[PDB]
Design a protein around this ligand. Structure first.
Ligand SMILES: Nc1ncnc2c1ncn2[C@@H]1O[C@H](COP(=O)(O)OP(=O)(O)NP(=O)(O)O)[C@@H](O)[C@H]1O
Ligand SMILES: [Mg+2]
Lengths: 217, 219
């Protein structure tokens, strides 16, 4: 109940800077219509939008974390169709995703929406820590299935590895909350609710690789 | 215990509605730049400032609740004012919202922001699951006041209703459409905290007709 409330407080705090900045751009546009170059007027509108996206990210992230607390209806579903949907949606010209999915359907018992979120957070984390390369793959063993994401980032040592699931940041870099940390903490909790486990390591290209195991019926 | 959750969900969830509207205004500027004149461009910007206030309002309400312990400070306000506010915000040049409000004002004991949130949720759904037609109406009765929103969508089959008021529960029909399964859950809680009642039904055109009744005290 309460680790959540504290977290909600952080979210509202982190929202202040983006929000103030939007009102600000909004206000100059409002007053400077006669005045402004179309180039600049566009750069305010563009920056507004970048900021709105920042907000939606944190809010969504929190809601997802919230949902993690409650029990969800499980069903049989194809892991590769879920991954496919998320990869399309996180798929951008900004970032190119390498798809290397197991070439057969994988049935696992899951709440699809929850899985979609776990995948999505892994992707954005891999887009932050990484240098642009992201690879999503899946596969299966007799007893358990898996999906994983990989970046060409710095590659996190087993020491820092533990303090990677922390939503709150020690430094107070003017931000109460780590999006990266909260994200992975969300993933951690979703995998657990599915009776799976996470497994971290180095990728093909030296970066981070996080893999999520799930039970097959 | 379960309740504290839906409070928190309600805050973050309801923050998105105004932000989203912003993305709509920002983009139209970003694209329409050559074309647009003062009068409208000035309006778009004003709309962004309104909606950013709304975000702070929502944030403020939560912080107050943290110090006060009291979440929805009640008071006598004009229901219609709040309705008109939401009708204005949510209708653009693209989208037009029909109106059958009660003439004059309706004084009700409410927490105006919270109701504004409720009405918003109802109206974004009417857009989300409807086919463009949306009608907001209000009226009053001997001891009660009401507002409803109506869409021309498929409505909600009575068998489904109780199921869909639960938090984080979406519709299979909804699966197609994006979302969170929270709007109705929130609307209910807000209306409950006002000791009101929700009444679902079929709209003028076969869609959902969702109506909130509020008590009007008597000296
Ligand atoms: N106006 C409507 N017409 C038809 N169906 C509706 C309407 N409003 C809600 N529904 C259905 O009721 C379900 C519950 O909606 P709700 O709990 O409001 O969250 P949501 O609209 O799914 N997502 P969100 O608003 O983003 O949290 C939806 O998934 C729809 O199937
Ligand atoms: Mg809704």
């Amino acid at each position: 109940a309460d680790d959540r409330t504290l977290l909600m407080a952080g979210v509202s705090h982190d929202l202040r800077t983006p929000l103030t900045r939007i009102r600000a751009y909004a206000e100059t546009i409002y007053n400077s219509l006669g005045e402004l170059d179309l180039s600049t007027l566009k750069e305010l509108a563009e920056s507004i939008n970048k900021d709105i996206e920042e907000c939606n990210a944190i809010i969504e992230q929190f809601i997802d974390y919230l949902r993690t607390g409650q029990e969800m209806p499980m069903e049989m579903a194809d892991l590769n169709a879920v991954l496919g949907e998320v990869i399309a949606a996180e798929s951008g010209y900004e970032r190119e995703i390498e798809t290397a999915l197991y070439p057969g359907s994988i049935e696992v018992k899951m709440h699809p929406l929850s899985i979609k979120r776990a995948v999505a957070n892994m992707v954005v984390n891999a887009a932050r820590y990484g240098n642009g390369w992201i690879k999503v793959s899946s596969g299966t063993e007799p007893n358990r299935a898996w999906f994983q994401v990989e970046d060409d980032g710095p590659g996190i040592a087993p020491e820092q590895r533990k303090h990677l699931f922390q939503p709150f940041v020690r430094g107070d870099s003017a931000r109460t909350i780590s999006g990266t940390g909260l994200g992975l903490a969300i993933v951690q909790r979703i995998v657990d609710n599915h009776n799976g486990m996470l497994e971290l390591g180095t990728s093909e290209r030296g970066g981070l690789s996080i893999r999520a195991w799930l039970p097959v019926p």
